Amino acid sequence: GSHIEVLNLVTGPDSITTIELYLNTRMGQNDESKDNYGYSEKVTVANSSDQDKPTSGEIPTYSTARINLPMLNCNTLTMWEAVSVKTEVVGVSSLVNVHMATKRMYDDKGIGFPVEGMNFHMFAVGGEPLELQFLTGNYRTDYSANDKLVVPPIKHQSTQGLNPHYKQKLTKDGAFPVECWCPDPSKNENTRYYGSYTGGQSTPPVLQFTNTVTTVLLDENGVGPLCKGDGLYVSCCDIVGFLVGKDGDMQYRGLPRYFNILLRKRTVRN
Amino acid sequence: IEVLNLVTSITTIELYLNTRMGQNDESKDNYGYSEKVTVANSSDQDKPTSGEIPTYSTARINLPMLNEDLTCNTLTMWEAVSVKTEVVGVSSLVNVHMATKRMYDDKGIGFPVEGMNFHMFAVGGEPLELQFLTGNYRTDYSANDKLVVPPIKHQSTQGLNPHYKQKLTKDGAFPVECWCPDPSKNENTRYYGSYTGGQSTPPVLQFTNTVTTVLLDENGVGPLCKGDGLYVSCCDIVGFLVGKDGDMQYRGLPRYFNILLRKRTVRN
Amino acid sequence: NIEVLNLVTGPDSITTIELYLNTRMGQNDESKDNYGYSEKVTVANSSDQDKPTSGEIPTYSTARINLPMLNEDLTCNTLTMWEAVSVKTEVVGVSSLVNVHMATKRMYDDKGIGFPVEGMNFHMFAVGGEPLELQFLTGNYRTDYSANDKLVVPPIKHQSTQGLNPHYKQKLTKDGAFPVECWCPDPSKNENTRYYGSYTGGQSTPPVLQFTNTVTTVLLDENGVGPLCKGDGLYVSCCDIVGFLVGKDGDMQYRGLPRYFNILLRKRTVRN
Amino acid sequence: NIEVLNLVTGPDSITTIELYLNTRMGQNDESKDNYGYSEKVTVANSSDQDKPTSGEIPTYSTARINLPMLNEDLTCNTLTMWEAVSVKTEVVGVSSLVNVHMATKRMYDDKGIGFPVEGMNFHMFAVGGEPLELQFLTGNYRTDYSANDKLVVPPIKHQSTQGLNPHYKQKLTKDGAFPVECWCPDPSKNENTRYYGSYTGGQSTPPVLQFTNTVTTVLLDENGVGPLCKGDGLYVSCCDIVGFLVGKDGDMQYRGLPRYFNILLRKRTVRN
Amino acid sequence: IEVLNLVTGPDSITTIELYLNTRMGQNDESKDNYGYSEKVTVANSSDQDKPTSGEIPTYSTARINLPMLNEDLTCNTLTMWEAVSVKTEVVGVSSLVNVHMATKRMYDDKGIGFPVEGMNFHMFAVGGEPLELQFLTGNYRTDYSANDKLVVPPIKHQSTQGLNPHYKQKLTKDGAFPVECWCPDPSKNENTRYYGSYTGGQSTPPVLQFTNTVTTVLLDENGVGPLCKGDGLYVSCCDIVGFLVGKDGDMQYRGLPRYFNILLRKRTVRN
Ligand SMILES: CC(=O)N[C@H]1[C@H]([C@H](O)[C@H](O)CO)O[C@@](O)(C(=O)O)C[C@@H]1O
Ligand SMILES: CC(=O)N[C@H]1[C@H]([C@H](O)[C@H](O)CO)O[C@@](O)(C(=O)O)C[C@@H]1O
Structure with missing residues (x-):
């Protein structure tokens, strides 16, 4: 029903380090050598809720990485503590492009449609994997067109609300669908x-x-x-809209995210 | 309550509330949505179907029973200091392949859940006190006798009539459309x-x-917290799902709460 | 103006006033259908035939509240007045707008939701120690208010009232009578x-x-x-238009909501 | 550059100026119909035949206010000037936009509300001790303003004026005469x-x-x-476009509103 | 650079004022359509995405020479100008209050001409060296060869639709680097x-x-x-305010100039 012991900062030289990284988007075509990279495959629409089986690659997933930190280590131990982060979405200016092969305005005379529509932006920085709660708009969604997606092994009506029996940890890049996994607010x-x-x-x-x-x-x-076991965990998703093809076919578009994280040495009980 | 000194003594309470959009049974299809919305032919025959009406989510939490010395003239009560609250499952709205109407002559995305948003939460030491007010005084709630609504109707309830009040004491029962917080109480x-x-x-x-x-x-x-009860209430409507043929249903999301409490001494 | 002196201290120096004001959208009789809405909106054929029907015009809500009497003697060197320090105010019944099953126009070829109340929003409140001072300004100087002789409007019309003409002023002294469309707060007074x-x-x-x-x-x-608060009167005024209700055939009515006020006052000494 | 010294204190060291400016949307004669609106908007057939009609062009509102005289000997090493400290400013007549019964296009197959005034909004004000300094910049260098010889525009046209050409400047010295569409504040001066x-x-x-x-x-x-305030002159300027009125047949006119100012000034000693 | 103390006293502060005109594609101040792009065209397919010359907005930029500080570059410390603050504004916003140009119009040819409207993109940068850029495009196949004065990578790969750190540049030329394929490099700057x-x-x-x-x-x-390295101050920007919609539906980007007033102070650094 209703429901680490931290000591002092370590001071002096080498008590602070910074970690810098970027994560590329996982919109569905997640291979950097392929033509649709940075976009999803074409979106398809279910005929009925019990025949909702998205095609392979039309489903955005979380980006994530674990970064190794300098090894620190007794009655006490030292851990890296993340103090702050500077983060930004990269390539925003790429959206100033209206000459691509797209539907266009004003009876084929005007601009191409810019990437537009739904935006979803999230990031997380932690000392362990992001803890996830399953929640979906359709409990019957069949993810079996892509067995590399990580989803629950059974389905139930209750997962359209919060069923705490359906949880996970974000331990793989480009594998956990955004549409059915969210942060677990009872943990993290x-x-x-x-x-x-x-x-x-x-x-x-x-x-x-x-x-x-x-x-x-x-x-x-x-x-x-x-940072447990000297690992820093960074996760994100940045959907900036849809590209609208000539015939009305649409693909998600995502952008990369940059992180600059400042960490400091913290003494803890052991 | 005459409030005295802080006791120097703290606790937290964590919970979530699931949405009550109308189909409120976690074992059935369409959980977390309403039944299909219907539209009255006239204002004197406005009778929503059973389950098409969102209601408030609510629960009473039993706090740890504090020692009380009835021989003396003070009591200790739990005091809610702060709350961290979030809507859960927002990322579930990143879904445009459901069986819905679609964009661009049947070639584009499915319509995402979109339209009206309504978000409220409340934390208190007693039930949320409610004022009745409706867009149509004549609305007939008799398709669902589990809804709590006044026993009589009157034209004046399209404004504020202080004779029409209630307390939010049941989950999934008080329609959002006719009950709001009573600003003269609470x-x-x-x-x-x-x-x-x-x-x-x-x-x-x-x-x-x-x-x-x-x-x-x-x-x-x-x-x-009177009688060691903590009351938590909410509603989080995030839009409508638009079916293939234009039929529409409310969609709601759960809300998480983490409430910090402390002991407070009060006059008895 | 008033020469303000020191605050009065002690256990009787503060009071509070709580009230609500119901909306005055046009049908302002609580015993009748369409309370809290206007009558159906109509549209002029030309600017010189712009005569709104009775009850289709929103007006300001207002009240004067009597405060506890100060000053048993008025011949004194100084006097005491109530000074309004702060207000907690809220629009009541916002959740009533979560309703898409009313007899309305509807989405998606008669299969979707009823249109919610939507469109123009106008929200204002005022708290003062005397009536709200008003300036006339209209979108159409020729507007004819004679379908409803209970509305307070100027007795003469002139072209210059589509801008600011300081010869056209009033004070908000009656509830449900001063149209919002032609009276605004006078920023040179108040x-x-x-x-x-x-x-x-x-x-x-x-x-x-x-x-x-x-x-x-x-x-x-x-x-x-x-x-x-002059004469121990507190003046509270408002208007809260939240949109239009769209009937089945496209006819439209203003919808308003009530407003609640909780006002804290203190005693202030002034020169007399 | 004026060298500022100390504030002047004591009685009479502060003054206040209150005024309003009526809008200059194009029909700027308070005695005529359509005051506070433009004439109907017209659209060029081509960029080399872009000749707006007289009265369809909003302009800046402006006034020079004469301040109280600072009488003093001019031959000494200091002088006194009024210094503008703060302004309270408001758009007047906002509630006038709560009007959907004027002779306009309407919603829902001629059954719904008249269109309210809507669309483009442009709001600016300026307070200074000399005229607002202007930079010319236009969306079309070829615009022909000769339908109205009272407008103040440059005597020559050049392609470069679609960007910033610093050879094209002015001072806002006349009310209802400098078009908004081609004159903006000069950020290199002011x-x-x-x-x-x-x-x-x-x-x-x-x-x-x-x-x-x-x-x-x-x-x-x-x-x-x-x-x-040079020569004891205070300059106030503004423009407040609140959208377009849409007529029955789709003809459109700018609508503007007046602006109120309450300016507090103090005496400042300066080097002479 | 090892940063030491501020230099105090008379002449320790200076200001720089400038404006930059927009580079929307027609960037010749003597020609029609200055401050706009040429008409936008739309690719027939992804592998035939070859914009016309002048339809592509680019960054504005300038390097401003500051007063010379160091007569002897072999001293053990040197002085540099340090940019403290900037006042910047977009110029000509009121020019958008214009609905009588030769444009498409509202309400069955009776209403206002369409104002400049749609996509807005606004950025500025102030630095002590050129702005460092990262390449990222919506289409790796974009062919910029209709205008060889545009600075773009000679080789493009699919990975350029995300962040590939092999593809960088510096903003060293006004009116040359397309906004659509170059953004600030967050790993540098x-x-x-x-x-x-x-x-x-x-x-x-x-x-x-x-x-x-x-x-x-x-x-x-x-x-x-x-x-400011070598006593150079670098200012860069782009201000797209929307599109002008012509009578027939043809569209052009519209940009506006930006003004800058930058305050700088003398800073001692290790040499
Ligand atoms: C709010 C309301 O009064 N709904 C009524 C509806 C609608 O008028 C139509 O279905 C059009 O949506 O009609 C019913 O026969 C129904 O479908 O159950 C009765 C129901 O009471
Ligand atoms: C603002 C206004 O002038 N309204 C007038 C209306 C409208 O012109 C039409 O109804 C179109 O809505 O016509 C009336 O005959 C009416 O219906 O009562 C008189 C009324 O004065």
Whole structure:
């Protein structure tokens, strides 16, 4: 029904390190050598809810990585503590393109449709894998066209709400569908996550990019994510809209995300 | 309640509430949605079908029973200090392959869940106090006798008539469309709500585990839990699912709560 | 104006006033159908034949509240007045807009939802120590209000009233009588009132509304002085249009919601 | 460059100026029909035949206000100037946009509301101690303004004026005469003026407007110095376009609203 | 660069003022359509995506010479100009209050001409060296050979539809680097501050502000601003305010100029 012991900071030289990385988008065609890279395959639409079987590659998934940190280690131990992150979406300016082979405005005389519609942006930084809760708009969705997707082995009506028997951890890049996995708010004590969704059909994307913003990862007690086994975990998804082909066929478009994470040495009980 | 000193003594309570859009049985199809919306032919024959009406989610939590010294003139109560609350499953709206109407002459995406959004939560030391107010005084709720609605109707209930009140004491039973928070009461509850209307309006939603909502009032006093009960209420409508033929259903999402409480001494 | 002196201290120096105002959208009789809405909107054939029907015009809501009497003697060197310090105010019944089964026009070839109340939003409130002072300004100087002689409008019309003509003023002294479309707060007066307003227009625009019991609006001015209640009267005014209800055949009515107020006042000494 | 010294204190060291400016949308004669609107908008057949009709072009509103005389000996090493410290400004008549019964196009097969005034919004104001300095910049260098010889525009046309050509400048010295479409604030000058503006475009966009008497805008710069009023003149300028009125047959006109100002000034000593 | 103390006293501060005109595609100030692109064209297929010359917006940029600081470049410390703050505005916003140009129009040829509307893209950067760029495109197959004055990579690969760090550049030429395929490199630009926004969609209302009252601080979290290498200050921007829709539905980008007023101070550094 209703429901690590942190000591002092280590000071002096080499008590701080920074980790820098980017994650490329996982919209469905996730192979950097292939023509549709950075987009999904063409979206298809189920005839009925009990025949909802998306094609292989039409499904966005989370991006994720584990980064090795310098090895630190007794009655106490030292852990890396994530203090802050500077993060930005890369390639926003690529959306200033209206000459691609797309549907166009004004009786074939106007601009090509820009990438537009649904936006979904999330990132997470933690000291262990992001903990996931299963929740879907259709419990009957059949993911069997792509056995590389990680989804529950059984299906039940209750998964259109919150059924806590259906959980996971984000342990693989380009494998956990966004549409059915979300952060588990009853866990993730050692991760910070931030997300937004703007829906609708052809909604204008609203995006910003700057190298001047720092996000503090410390909690209300002044403690950041503590990196278990000297691993830092970073996850994200950045859907910026749909590309609309000549005939009306549509694909998700995603952009990469950059991270610069500041960490510090923290002594902990052992 | 005359509030005295803090006891120096803390606890947290964690829970979620599932949405009550109308199909509220977790074992059946369409859980977390309403039944198909229907439309009255006239205002004097406005009788929603059973299960097409969203209602408030709510629960009462039994807190740890505090020692009380009835021989003395003070008592200890739990005081709700703050809450971290989030809508769960927002990413589930990133789905345009469901059996829905679709864009661009049957070649484009399925329509995502879109349209009206309604988001509210409340945390208090007693049931959320409600005021009746409706868009149509004549609405007939008799297709579902489990709904809690007034026993009589009157034209004046399209505005504020203070003779029509209730308390949110049952989950999945009080229609959002005719009950709102009573701003003349709720001295011992904090509530927060928003509505964004229109037909096919983009949902705009956020989720994070980093935001704390302070529940202390202007005197530094949080909700005080009468009889060791903590009351949590919400509703989170994120839009409508548009079926192939244009039939529509409300879609709602669950809400998570993590409430911090402390012991407070009060006059008995 | 009033010469403001020190605050009065002690255990009787504060009071609070709580009230609500029901909306005045046009059908303002609580015993009748369509309460809280206007009558059906009609459209002029030409600007010189612009005569709204009775009850299709929203008006301001207003009340004067009697405060506890101060000053048993009025011949004194100084007097005491109630000073409004702050207000907690909310729009009531926002959740009532979560209703798409009313007898309305509907989406997707008669299969989808009923249209929710949507379109133009207009929200304002005022708290003062005397009636809200008003300036006339209209979109059409020729508008003929004679279908309803209970509306308070100027007795003469002139072209210049489509801009600001300071010869056309009034005070908000009657509930449900001053049309919103032709009367606005007079920004050259209202020294003893605080007012706040917003407008979001367009045809079928989503209403965007909030409600909470946690927000206090401070009424003190830049000198730390709130509205001072002349004759021990507190004046509260508002209007809250949340959109239009679209009937089956396309006919439309304004929809308004009530507003709640909880006002904190304190005793202030003034020169007499 | 004026060298600022100390503030002058004591009685009579502060003054206030209150005024309003009526809108200059194109029909700018308060005695005539359509005051506060433009004439109907016309559309060029080609960029080399872009000759707007007289009265279809919004212009800036502006006034020079004579301040109280600062009488003093002019031969000494200091002088006194009025310094504008802050302004409270509001758009007047926002509630007038709550009107959907005017002779307009209407919604839902001639059954619904008249279209409210909607679309493009442009709001700007400026307070300074000399005229607002202007930069010419246009969307079409060939625009022919000769239908109305009272408009102030450059005497020559050149392709480069579709960007910033610093040889094309002016000063806002006349009300209802400088078109908004081709004159903007010069950001390389205006050291002695503060200006603030916003534009929201699109075709039928909802106007989003606020009004309150509770907001003060500080005019002091980063060094604590406000506009200094040369020759005891205070310059106020604005434009407030709130959208278009859509007539029965689809003909459209700009609609503007007046703006109110309350400006606080103080005496400042300057080097002579 | 090892940053030491501020230089104080008379002449320790200077200001730079400039504007940059927009580079939408027709970038010749003596010709018609200046400040706009040429007419937008649409590829028939992905492998025939070859924009016409002049239809492609590029970044504006300039390097400004600052007062010379070091007569002897072999001293054990040197002085550099440090950019502290910038006041920047988009110029000519009021020019968008124009609905009588030769455009498509509303309401069955009776209403207003369409105003410039749709996609907005706004960015500026101030730094002590050229803005560092990362290549990223919506279509690796885009053929820029209709205009060999555009600076783009000679070899393009599918991986350029995401972030491939092998594809970088520096913004060293005005009116030459297309916005559609070059963005700031977030893994570099340690000595530049950049700010950008994009609002997309088809006919979206432009939402724009202008004022002379806002100062943007360029100091980083350590209190250090961009340090001007070789006494050069680098300013870059792009301000797309939408499209002009011609009578027949043909569309062109419209851009506006941007003004900058930059305050700089003398900073000692190790040499
Ligand atoms: C709100 C309302 O009154 N709905 C009524 C509906 C609608 O008028 C039509 O279905 C059109 O949607 O008709 C019913 O026969 C039905 O379908 O069950 C009765 C129901 O009470
Ligand atoms: C604003 C206005 O002038 N309304 C007038 C209307 C409208 O012109 C039409 O009904 C079209 O809606 O016509 C009336 O005969 C009516 O219906 O009562 C008189 C009324 O004065």
